[PDB]
Short mmCIF file of C-alpha atoms in Angstrom, two decimals:
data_model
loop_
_atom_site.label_atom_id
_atom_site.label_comp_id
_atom_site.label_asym_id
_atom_site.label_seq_id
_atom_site.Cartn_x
_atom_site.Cartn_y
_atom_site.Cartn_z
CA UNK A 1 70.09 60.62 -13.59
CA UNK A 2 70.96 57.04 -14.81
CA UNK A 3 73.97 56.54 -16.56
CA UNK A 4 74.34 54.35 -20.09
CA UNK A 5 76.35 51.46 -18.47
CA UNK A 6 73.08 51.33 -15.84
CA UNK A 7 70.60 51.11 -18.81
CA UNK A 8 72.52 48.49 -20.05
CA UNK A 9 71.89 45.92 -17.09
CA UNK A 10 68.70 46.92 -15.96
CA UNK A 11 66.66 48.22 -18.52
CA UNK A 12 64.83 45.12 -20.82
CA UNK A 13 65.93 44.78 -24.53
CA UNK A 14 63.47 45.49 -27.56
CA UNK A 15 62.73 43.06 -30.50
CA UNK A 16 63.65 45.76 -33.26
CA UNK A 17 67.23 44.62 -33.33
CA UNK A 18 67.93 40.84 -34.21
CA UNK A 19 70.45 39.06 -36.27
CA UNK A 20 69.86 35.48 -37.79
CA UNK A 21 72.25 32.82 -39.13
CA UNK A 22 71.21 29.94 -41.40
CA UNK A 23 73.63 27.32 -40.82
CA UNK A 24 76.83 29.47 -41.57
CA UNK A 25 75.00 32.29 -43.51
CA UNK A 26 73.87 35.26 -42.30
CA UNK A 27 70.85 36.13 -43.91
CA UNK A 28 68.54 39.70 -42.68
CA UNK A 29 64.85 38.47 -42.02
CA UNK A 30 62.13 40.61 -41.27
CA UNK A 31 60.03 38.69 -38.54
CA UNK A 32 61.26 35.79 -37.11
CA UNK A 33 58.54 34.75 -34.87
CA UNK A 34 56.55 31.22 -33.04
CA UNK A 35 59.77 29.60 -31.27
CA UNK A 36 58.55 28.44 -28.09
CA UNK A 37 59.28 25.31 -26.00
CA UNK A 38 55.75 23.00 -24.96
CA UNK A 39 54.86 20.11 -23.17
CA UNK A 40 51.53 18.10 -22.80
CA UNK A 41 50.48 16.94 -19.09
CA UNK A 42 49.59 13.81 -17.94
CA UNK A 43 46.94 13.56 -15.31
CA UNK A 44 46.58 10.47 -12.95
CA UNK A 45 43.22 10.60 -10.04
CA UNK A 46 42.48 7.77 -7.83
CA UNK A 47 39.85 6.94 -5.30
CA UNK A 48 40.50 8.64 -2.20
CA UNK A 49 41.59 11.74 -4.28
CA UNK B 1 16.23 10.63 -1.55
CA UNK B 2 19.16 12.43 -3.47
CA UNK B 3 21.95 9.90 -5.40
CA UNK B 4 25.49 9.91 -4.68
CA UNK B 5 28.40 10.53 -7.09
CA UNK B 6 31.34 7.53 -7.91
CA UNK B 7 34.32 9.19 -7.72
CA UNK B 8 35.17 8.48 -3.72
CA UNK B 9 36.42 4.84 -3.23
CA UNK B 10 38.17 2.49 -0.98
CA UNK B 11 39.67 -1.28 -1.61
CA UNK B 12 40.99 -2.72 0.92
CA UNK B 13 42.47 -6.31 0.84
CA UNK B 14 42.33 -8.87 3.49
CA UNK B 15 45.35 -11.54 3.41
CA UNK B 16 44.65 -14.21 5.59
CA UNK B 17 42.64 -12.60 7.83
CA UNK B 18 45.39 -9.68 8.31
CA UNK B 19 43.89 -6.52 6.84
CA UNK B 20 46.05 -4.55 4.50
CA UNK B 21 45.96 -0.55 4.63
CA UNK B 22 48.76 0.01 2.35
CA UNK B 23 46.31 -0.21 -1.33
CA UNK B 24 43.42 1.44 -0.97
CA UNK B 25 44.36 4.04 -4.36
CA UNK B 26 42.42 2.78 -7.18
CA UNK B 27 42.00 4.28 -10.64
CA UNK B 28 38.32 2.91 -11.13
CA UNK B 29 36.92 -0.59 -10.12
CA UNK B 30 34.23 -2.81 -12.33
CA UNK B 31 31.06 -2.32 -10.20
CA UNK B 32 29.06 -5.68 -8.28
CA UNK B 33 26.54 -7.48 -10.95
CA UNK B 34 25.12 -10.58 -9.40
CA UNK B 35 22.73 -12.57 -11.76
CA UNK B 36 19.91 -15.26 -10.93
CA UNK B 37 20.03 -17.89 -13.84
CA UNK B 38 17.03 -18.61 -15.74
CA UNK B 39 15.86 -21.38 -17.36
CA UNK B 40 12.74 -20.72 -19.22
CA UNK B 41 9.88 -23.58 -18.69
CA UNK B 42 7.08 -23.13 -21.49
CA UNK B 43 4.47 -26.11 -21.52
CA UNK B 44 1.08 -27.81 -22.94
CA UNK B 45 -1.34 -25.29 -24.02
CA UNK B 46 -0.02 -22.39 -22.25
CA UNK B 47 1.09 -20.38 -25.20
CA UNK B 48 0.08 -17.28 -24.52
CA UNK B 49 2.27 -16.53 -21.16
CA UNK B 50 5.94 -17.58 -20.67
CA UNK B 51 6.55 -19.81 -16.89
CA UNK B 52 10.47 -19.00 -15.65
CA UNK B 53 12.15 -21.46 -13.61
CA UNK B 54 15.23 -20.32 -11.15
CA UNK B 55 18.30 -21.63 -11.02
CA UNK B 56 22.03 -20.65 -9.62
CA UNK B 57 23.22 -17.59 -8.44
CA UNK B 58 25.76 -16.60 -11.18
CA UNK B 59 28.34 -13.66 -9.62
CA UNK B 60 30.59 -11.18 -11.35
CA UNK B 61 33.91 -10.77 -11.78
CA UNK B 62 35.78 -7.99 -10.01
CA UNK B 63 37.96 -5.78 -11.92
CA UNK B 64 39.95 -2.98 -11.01
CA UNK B 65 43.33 -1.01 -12.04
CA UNK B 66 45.55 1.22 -10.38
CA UNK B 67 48.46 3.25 -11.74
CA UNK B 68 51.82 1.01 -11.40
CA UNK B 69 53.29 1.85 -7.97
CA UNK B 70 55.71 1.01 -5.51
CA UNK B 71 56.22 -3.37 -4.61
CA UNK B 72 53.25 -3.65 -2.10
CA UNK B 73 51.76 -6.39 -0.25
CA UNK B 74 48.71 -6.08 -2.92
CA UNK B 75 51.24 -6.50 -5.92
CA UNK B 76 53.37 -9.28 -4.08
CA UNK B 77 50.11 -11.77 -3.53
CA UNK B 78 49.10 -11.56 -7.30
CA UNK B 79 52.84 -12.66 -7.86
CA UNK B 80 52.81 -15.42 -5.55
CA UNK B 81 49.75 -16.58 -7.10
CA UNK B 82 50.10 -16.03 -10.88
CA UNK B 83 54.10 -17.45 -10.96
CA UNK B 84 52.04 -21.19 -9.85
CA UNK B 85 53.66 -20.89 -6.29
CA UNK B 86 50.22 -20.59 -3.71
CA UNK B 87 46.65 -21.03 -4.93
CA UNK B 88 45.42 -18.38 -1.59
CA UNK B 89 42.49 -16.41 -1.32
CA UNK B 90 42.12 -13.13 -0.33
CA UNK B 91 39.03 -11.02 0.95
CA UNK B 92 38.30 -7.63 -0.73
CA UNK B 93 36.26 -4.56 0.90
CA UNK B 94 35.24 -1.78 -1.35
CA UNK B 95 33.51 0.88 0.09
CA UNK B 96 32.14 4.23 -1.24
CA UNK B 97 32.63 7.44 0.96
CA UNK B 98 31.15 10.53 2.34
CA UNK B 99 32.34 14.15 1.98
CA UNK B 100 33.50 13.60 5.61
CA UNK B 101 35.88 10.59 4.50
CA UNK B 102 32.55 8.01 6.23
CA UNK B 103 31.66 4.62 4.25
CA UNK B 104 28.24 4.89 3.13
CA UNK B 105 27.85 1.21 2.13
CA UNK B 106 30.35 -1.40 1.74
CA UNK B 107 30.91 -4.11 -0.15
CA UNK B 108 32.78 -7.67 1.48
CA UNK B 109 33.71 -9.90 -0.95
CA UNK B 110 34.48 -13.23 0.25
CA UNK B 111 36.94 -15.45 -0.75
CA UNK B 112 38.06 -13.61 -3.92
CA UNK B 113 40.75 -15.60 -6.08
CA UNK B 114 42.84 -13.58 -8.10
CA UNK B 115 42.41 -14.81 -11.47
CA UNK B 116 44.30 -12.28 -14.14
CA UNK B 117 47.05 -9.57 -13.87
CA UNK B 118 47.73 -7.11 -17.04
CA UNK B 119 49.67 -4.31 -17.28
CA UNK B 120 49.25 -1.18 -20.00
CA UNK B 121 51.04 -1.21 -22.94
CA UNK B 122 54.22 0.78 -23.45
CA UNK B 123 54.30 3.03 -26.36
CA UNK B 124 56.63 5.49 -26.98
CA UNK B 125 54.20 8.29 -29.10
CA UNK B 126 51.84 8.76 -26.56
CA UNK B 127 51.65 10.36 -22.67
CA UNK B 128 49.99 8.02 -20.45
CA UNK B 129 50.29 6.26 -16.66
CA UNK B 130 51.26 2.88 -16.74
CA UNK B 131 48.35 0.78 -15.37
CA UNK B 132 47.57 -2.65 -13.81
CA UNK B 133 44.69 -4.24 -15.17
CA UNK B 134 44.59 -6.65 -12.54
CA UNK B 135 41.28 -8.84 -12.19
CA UNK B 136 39.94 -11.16 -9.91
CA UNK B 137 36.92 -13.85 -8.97
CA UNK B 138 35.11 -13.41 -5.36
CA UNK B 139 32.58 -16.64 -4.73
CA UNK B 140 30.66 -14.49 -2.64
CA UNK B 141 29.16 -10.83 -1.71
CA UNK B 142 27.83 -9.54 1.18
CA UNK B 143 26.86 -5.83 1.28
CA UNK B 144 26.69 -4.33 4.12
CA UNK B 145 25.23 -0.78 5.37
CA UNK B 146 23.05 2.51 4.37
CA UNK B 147 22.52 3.89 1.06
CA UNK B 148 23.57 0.60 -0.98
#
């Protein structure tokens, strides 16, 4: 029997609920999606291994 | 029998006749051509078969490049010799290896002068290690063991 205030800090949070803002306008979108945060890798092998 | 692969290698540098253990990581190294000179001889009324005629033993030069590392005693004997202070020469051994970390054959390069030192380029749009280009001229090479 968990309570609401339990949900609220365990349970994970679904995408169906989102708010965006342009600059200083708040504008309702429909998907907002491909954010992500890459980097490349540099590889360096010598001799001995 | 079966070949061996050219990924396992060891350079080690001799300064003076005091060995140094501290640069043996390479990135690659140039390979050994030696080449007999040739002077080509053709005479009279043989002209049908050519008649070569030796001449001096004409060594290669040795490069090899390594990924820009901590001051060594490798890095401070180029810049000794490349900032005009001491023309000094310095023996090289490169040897393969086994799976077992064994030399199979080695390579002793006598009395190798180090001739040029070049870095990479920097560039700012592109991910790469910084490398030393740094090549030099042996007089002489002796190999020495199994599976040459």
């Amino acid at each position: 029997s968990t309570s609401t205030s339990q949900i609220a800090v365990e349970y994970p949070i679904p995408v169906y609920r989102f708010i965006v803002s342009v600059g200083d306008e708040k504008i309702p979108f429909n998907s907002v999606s491909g954010l992500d945060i890459s980097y490349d890798t540099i590889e360096y092998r010598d001799g001995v291994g | 029998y079966t070949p061996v692969v050219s990924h396992r290698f060891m350079a080690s540098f001799i300064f003076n006749r005091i060995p140094d253990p501290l640069d043996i990581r390479f990135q690659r190294i140039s390979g050994l051509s030696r080449e007999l000179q040739v002077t080509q001889y053709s005479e009279g009324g043989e002209n049908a078969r050519n008649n070569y005629l030796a001449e001096k033993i004409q060594h290669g030069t040795l490069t090899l490049e390594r990924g820009v590392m901590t001051v060594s005693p490798l890095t401070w004997m180029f810049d000794r010799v490349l900032s005009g202070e001491k023309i000094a020469y310095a023996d090289v051994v490169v040897m393969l290896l086994n799976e077992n970390s064994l030399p199979l054959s080695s390579w002793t390069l006598s009395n190798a002068l180090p001739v040029r030192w070049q870095t990479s380029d920097f560039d700012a749009n592109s991910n790469a290690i910084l490398v030393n280009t740094l090549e030099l001229r042996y007089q002489d090479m002796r190999w020495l063991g199994v599976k040459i």
